[PDB]
Amino acid sequence: MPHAFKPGDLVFAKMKGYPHWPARIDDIADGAVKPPPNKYPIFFFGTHETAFLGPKDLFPYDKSKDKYGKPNKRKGFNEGLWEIQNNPHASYS
């Protein structure tokens, strides 16, 4: 059965107005800003943006890739697909 989300989990993350987007659950570094309660820090591949999202917007990558893992014209998306497939745990700083 599934566990709660944890840092390093890979997902497609959904934001109003954007296609389901390759992303990961990030860690929070020592001394770094924490997310609000019930929210996770989501690192979006390709754009390298962070937003705070709850589970309703997080789709596990293995289950969802056949549906959501296809090229999109949006800035940074295809770069994102390469990152999530080829080096999802690297430093993108």
Ligand X SMILES: CN(CC(=O)N1CCCCC1)S(C)(=O)=O
Q: How far is the CB of 1 from ligand X (least distance, A)?
A: 29
Piece of 4-12, 30-38, 43-51, 59-67 that binds ligand X (CB under 6 A):
43-51
For residue 80, what is the enclosing H or E element?
helix 77-86
Residue written as token pair 């990152």: 83
Closest-CA residue to 90 (of 5, 26, 18, 11): 26
- Candidates 5, 9, 26, 51; binder of ligand X (CB under 6 A) is 51
Q: How far is the CB of 47 from ligand X (least distance, A)?
A: 4
Torsion over CA of 26, 31, 35 and 40, rounded to 10 degrees?
20
Nearer to ligand X, 21 or 40 (CB): 21
> With CB under 6 A, what is the number of residues at the site for ligand X?
7
